[PDB]
């Protein structure tokens, strides 16, 4: 569990688990490559406990724009949706606001846990990027949906040993390039 | 082409799980906001760079099911359908060779993976999407030459595409047609030599490993700086609050706030400089992709030594490899 | 007449596209917004205490004896100096980015406006014909006029035509067939022409070339001579 611990004079916040570290009778505490305490010897029973920091991450808000709709989706970056769901049920998350979190609106992305958007199989061009191929948009009763973005339409080329395509017409096109 | 994207929460890094420190940090103004904007801008720039280099084709092109291109063997260039992610043999080699990063993405999850308020963000495009763009570019080049780059894709037999590229460099068509078998054999040999060279040379991909190493070093240094005292009695805020009365804790905390804030500003400054260097590299990669993959460049040494005929892109982690 | 009408239509569409879309000029508006934000942030930093009892120097001088007033003022000096130093560093980085953009704009102007660039996608999408500069606040806008192929048809082709045992190759073009007759056409615009000894060149016999097809290459001189001499 995520708890506030105080072992003798070393205090902190973290999750204590049974360790797999080969402590000698000599060592009392452990540290990783960046000199952060990550293991302790329990003053009683001498159990060696690993300290995992409590889960955290950034929060992103996906908004269609307030001139269209006031519904938003929340991405909890960096964590598994199982831990977010448990934190919601336990009322442990630092933000005090909540999202409806109804069935089918919680989707696991590579970026994080996306709550408040319906994932669909149909692929669309990317609108609001989320990450790892997943984008969100506001579409139909309009609601926020999430999808794996399309890269483009397919166009097979009619290649053959003796077939060539020759233009019979042309277009004169004018494009705009803006440079600071 | 791209740099590892990071986002750093100023408050957690400087004043983790410390209300008094956070309240003191509020007296320095917008600095935390400015660093947040700088890192967000870098992350957006890296996704823009990847899209500009690889997403240069409007449609996804496919090769014919009968992969006969006049004797030219592209099996080592085109996607290998039997493996997950559909990378070509060369792309798969590149992926196996340079992926020494600590994943490089969140993956729904340094021993602590720098979980001190430093979050690495995933790219917008996955390796499969980049491979798909590369495959589309390869199919377009192979089946339609440069007509694909300028407008709609127009099919042309590959040896006639080569004949016109020969005219481009300044060699007549009959040289290719009379020596078509020799040219196809030399091409296939060169491709095999490239695969062997990349496999056998660990340093071949040094540019991308160096980019990964520099970002890993920057994050390792930023985390390491948290252990410094910067003149304080202790590097741990909880020891300062538990040991000292507020009027002294404010002084020791202020010293630590100054040290950590300087560490974040130094980190952000180096990331902005590296972002500018990566953006310049990405712009060069996009220029080469347009000039040499979507056309036949006449610029000397721009795309390989010798008279330019063509090029083929290959995806690599955080970058692009061109075979000229 | 068709080309002039298409050009005029494209220019009108460009004016309408820029007018209609609020984000068309985002690249320059972002530069303006970043400079305005940098100055507003730099001014707002003067309000911060940076750990001092007050952001106003006169309050420090009026409240404390010289020793503590100097300590509190030195703290504010450190805060403001760090803020300015950060501002200048960020402006140096932004200036380097603008320099790179300006160098690209100058290259684009030389290659695209003062000449006809052969570089693909450098001077717009399509085959480059010409470009026109327009000024803009803090920047330049280029109108790139290009040739885009349209309405393609696929024809049967061959690398060479075999006449009297000799392999004929196009001098400037590609051999195409409509299904009954073989013609020479330019690659970028369908315009069939009769295959003659003036349009093709001869190199080698009809054996080495893969995919050579049999047809007649019309030599004009012989045809005239068979009329002249009778
Ligand atoms: C090559 O493509 C161009 C278009 O890019 C063709 O010109 C266009 O031809 C159509 C008719 O097929 C014209 O539409 C007509 O316009 C008049 C305008 O008064 C209208 O009254 C008619 O009812 C009809 O809408 C179109 O305007 C014209 N475009 C231009 C710019 O002149 C051209 O014929 C094509 N050539 C070949 C060989 O395919
Ligand atoms: C295009 O090139 C690829 C290779 O770059 C060709 O695939 C290769 O085909 C040869 C055929 O003998 C394979 O050789 C194999 O060698 C092992 C021993 O090393 C032997 O046990 C096998 O029975 C076989 O003889 C080679 O492994 C294979 N390579 C790959 C990567 O598949 C392909 O056939 C070429 N395409 C054309 C149309 O020629
Ligand atoms: C131009 O150079 C190419 C090579 O870059 C020449 O082709 C090469 O010709 C030699 C023979 O002179 C070939 O060696 C032979 O290979 C066969 C393979 O079975 C072997 O059995 C023979 O004992 C001998 O080693 C070589 O393979 C061949 N290379 C290629 C890629 O085809 C070409 O002849 C040169 N032409 C002129 C006009 O100089
Ligand atoms: C492939 O192209 C050739 C030449 O462009 C086509 O042959 C030509 O077809 C036209 C059809 O109108 C012929 O015009 C007619 O000629 C006769 C006299 O020969 C005249 O009495 C008619 O009033 C009309 O003017 C033209 O002569 C003919 N030329 C040749 C050399 O055959 C051919 O039909 C095309 N094939 C396909 C499948 O598109
Ligand atoms: C083009 O014409 C030549 C004849 O001028 C053809 O050559 C003949 O080919 C047949 C088999 O196809 C042989 O039996 C004859 O002996 C060949 N004669 C000569 C003089 O070579 C040639 O095959 C024709 N090519 C095509 C593609 O039709
Ligand atoms: C005494 O210490 C032992 C080992 O540390 C522990 O198992 C036991 O419960 C302790 N007894 C107490 C605290 O009464
Ligand atoms: C092209 O020629 C080869 C010759 O081996 C043949 O196998 C292939 O099927 C031909 N392509 C088509 C599209 O018929
Ligand atoms: C995320 O949680 C699910 C819950 O069953 C688990 O199966 C999955 O392995 C977890 N993924 C990671 C990366 O921890
Ligand atoms: C190309 O070849 C024939 C027409 O000659 C037809 O079967 C095929 O659909 C054509 N395809 C295109 C894209 O023109």
CA distance C198 to C97: 55
Nearest CA to C54 out of B27, B230, B196 is that of B27
Which chains have at least 3 CB atom pairs separated by less than 8 Å from chain A? Answer: B, C
Q: Which ligand is nearest to the CA of B184?
A: 3
State the nearest Cα–Cα gap between A169 and chain C, in angstroms.
5
Which contiguous run of DSSP H or E holds residue B43?
Answer: helix B31-54
Which contiguous run of DSSP H or E holds residue B286?
Answer: helix B246-288
* Contact criterion met (CB < 8 Å) for A154 and B59: yes
The alpha carbons of chain C give a radius of gyration, in whole angstroms, of 35
**Cα-to-centroid distance, B173 and ligand 3 (Å):** 21
CA distances from A137 to A126, A140, A147 (A): 8, 10, 8
For B101, list phi and psi in degrees, rounded to 5. -70, 160
The alpha carbons of chain A give a radius of gyration, in whole angstroms, of 26
Nearest CA to B62 out of B8, B132, B129 is that of B132
Positions of chain breaks in chain A, given as the residue before each break (C to N > 2.5 Å): 140
**The tokens of C223 are what?**
């045809």
Cα B260 to chain centroid, rounded: 29
Nearest CA to B31 out of A112, C150, C83 is that of C83
A157, B139 Cβ separation under 8 angstroms: yes
| Cβ–ligand 8 contact at B109 (below 6 Å) | yes
- Per CB-CB distance under 8 Å, the chain A contacts of B160 are 164
B3, B281 Cβ separation under 8 angstroms: no
Method: cryo-EM
**Cα-to-centroid distance, C128 and ligand 5 (Å):** 45
For B18, list phi and psi in degrees, rounded to 5. -135, 110
Nearest CA to B244 out of B11, B10, B20, B75 is that of B20
Resolution of this model in Å is 2.9
* Contact criterion met (CB < 8 Å) for B30 and C41: yes
Which ranges of C21-157 does DSSP label H, i.e. alpha helix? 26-44, 57-63, 66-108
* Contact criterion met (CB < 8 Å) for A172 and C146: yes
Q: Which residues line ligand 9 (CB under 6 A)?
A: A 158, 163; C 154
Query: Helices B246-288 and B206-224 meet at what angle, rounded to 10?
Result: 170
CA distance A114 to A101: 10
**The tokens of C87 are what?**
């501002």
State the nearest Cα–Cα gap between B12 and chain C, in angstroms.
19
- A14: number of Cβ within 10 Å: 19
CA distance B215 to B221: 10
* Contact criterion met (CB < 8 Å) for B177 and C209: yes
B272, B218 Cβ separation under 8 angstroms: no
The gap between the terminal CA atoms of chain C, to the nearest Å, is 47
- Per CB-CB distance under 8 Å, the chain C contacts of B48 are none
Which residue CA neighbors atom 2 of ligand 3 most closely?
A: B182
* Contact criterion met (CB < 8 Å) for A174 and C14: yes
CA distance C38 to A70: 31
CB-count burial class (<10 Å; 0-12, 13-18, 19+) for C74:
exposed
Nearest CB among A78, A159, A164 relative to B64 is that of A159
A38 touches chain B (CB under 8 A): yes
Nearest CA to C111 out of C94, C126, C133 is that of C133
**The tokens of A54 are what?**
């409590």
């Amino acid at each position: 569990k995520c708890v506030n611990f105080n072992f003798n004079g070393l205090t902190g916040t973290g999750v204590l688990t049974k360790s797999n570290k080969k402590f000698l009778p000599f060592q009392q505490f452990g540290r990783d490559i960046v000199d952060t305490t990550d293991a302790v010897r329990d003053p009683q029973t001498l159990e060696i406990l690993d300290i995992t920091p409590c889960s955290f991450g950034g929060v992103s808000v996906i908004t269609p724009g307030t001139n269209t709709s006031n519904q938003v989706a929340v991405l909890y970056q960096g964590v598994n949706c199982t831990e977010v769901s448990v934190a919601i049920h336990a009322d442990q998350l630092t933000p005090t606001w909540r999202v409806y979190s109804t069935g089918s609106n919680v989707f696991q992305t590579r970026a994080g846990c996306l709550i408040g958007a319906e994932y669909v199989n149909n692929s669309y061009e990317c609108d609001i990027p989320i990450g790892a191929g997943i984008c969100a948009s506001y579409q139909t009763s309009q609601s926020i949906i999430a999808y794996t973005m399309s890269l483009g339409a397919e166009n097979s080329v009619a290649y053959s040993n003796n077939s060539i395509a020759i233009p019979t017409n042309f277009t004169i096109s004018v494009t705009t390039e803006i440079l600071p | 082409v791209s740099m590892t994207k990071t986002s750093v929460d100023c408050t957690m890094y400087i004043c983790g799980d410390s209300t008094e420190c956070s309240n003191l940090l509020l007296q320095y103004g917008s600095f935390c906001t400015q660093l947040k904007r700088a890192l967000t801008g870098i992350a957006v720039e890296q996704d823009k760079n990847t899209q500009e280099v690889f997403a240069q084709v409007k449609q996804i092109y496919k090769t014919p099911p009968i992969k006969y291109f006049g004797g030219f063997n592209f099996s080592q260039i085109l996607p290998d359908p039997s493996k997950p992610s559909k990378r070509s043999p060369i792309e798969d080699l590149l992926f196996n060779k340079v992926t020494l990063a600590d994943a490089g993405f969140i993956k729904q999850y340094i021993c602590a993976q720098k979980f001190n308020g430093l979050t690495v963000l995933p790219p917008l495009l996955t390796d499969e999407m980049i491979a798909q763009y590369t495959s589309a570019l390869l199919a377009g080049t192979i089946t339609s030459g440069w007509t694909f780059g300028a407008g709609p894709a127009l099919q042309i037999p590959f040896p006639m595409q080569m004949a016109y590229r020969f005219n481009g460099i300044g060699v007549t068509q009959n040289v290719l047609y009379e020596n078509q078998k020799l040219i196809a054999n030399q091409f296939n040999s060169a491709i095999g030599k490239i695969q062997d060279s990349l496999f056998s040379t660990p340093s071949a991909l040094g540019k991308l490993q160096d980019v990964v190493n520099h970002n890993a070093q920057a994050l390792n240094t930023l985390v390491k700086q948290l252990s410094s005292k910067f003149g304080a009695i202790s590097s741990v805020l909880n020891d300062i609050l538990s040991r000292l009365d507020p009027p002294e804790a404010e002084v020791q905390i202020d010293r630590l706030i100054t040290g950590r804030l300087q560490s974040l500003q130094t980190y952000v400054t180096q990331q902005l400089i590296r972002a500018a260097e990566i953006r310049a590299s990405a712009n060069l990669a996009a220029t080469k992709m347009s000039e040499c993959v979507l056309g036949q460049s006449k610029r000397v040494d721009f795309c390989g030594k010798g008279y330019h005929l063509m090029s083929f892109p290959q995806s690599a982690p955080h970058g692009v490899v061109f075979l000229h | 007449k068709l080309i002039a009408n298409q050009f005029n239509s494209a220019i009108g569409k460009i004016q309408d596209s820029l007018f209609s879309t609020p984000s068309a000029l985002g690249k320059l508006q972002d530069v303006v917004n970043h400079n305005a934000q940098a100055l507003n942030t730099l001014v707002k930093q003067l309000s911060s205490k940076f750990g001092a009892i007050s952001s106003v120097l006169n309050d420090i001088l009026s409240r404390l004896d010289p020793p503590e007033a100097e300590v509190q003022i030195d703290r504010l000096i450190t805060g403001r100096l760090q803020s300015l130093q950060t501002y200048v560093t960020q402006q140096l980085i932004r200036a380097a980015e603008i320099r790179a953009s300006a160098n690209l704009a100058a290259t684009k102007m030389s290659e695209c406006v003062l000449g006809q660039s052969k570089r693909v996608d450098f001077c717009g999408k399509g085959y480059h014909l010409m470009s026109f500069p327009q000024s803009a606040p803090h920047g330049v806008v280029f109108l790139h006029v290009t040739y885009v192929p349209a309405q393609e048809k696929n024809f049967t082709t061959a690398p060479a035509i075999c006449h009297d045992g000799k392999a004929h190759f196009p001098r400037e073009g590609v051999f195409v067939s409509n299904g009954t007759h073989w013609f020479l056409t330019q690659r970028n615009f369908y315009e069939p022409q009769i295959i003659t000894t003036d349009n093709t060149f001869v190199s080698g016999n009809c054996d080495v070339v893969i995919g050579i097809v049999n047809n007649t290459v019309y030599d004009p001189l012989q045809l005239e001579l068979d009329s002249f001499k009778e």
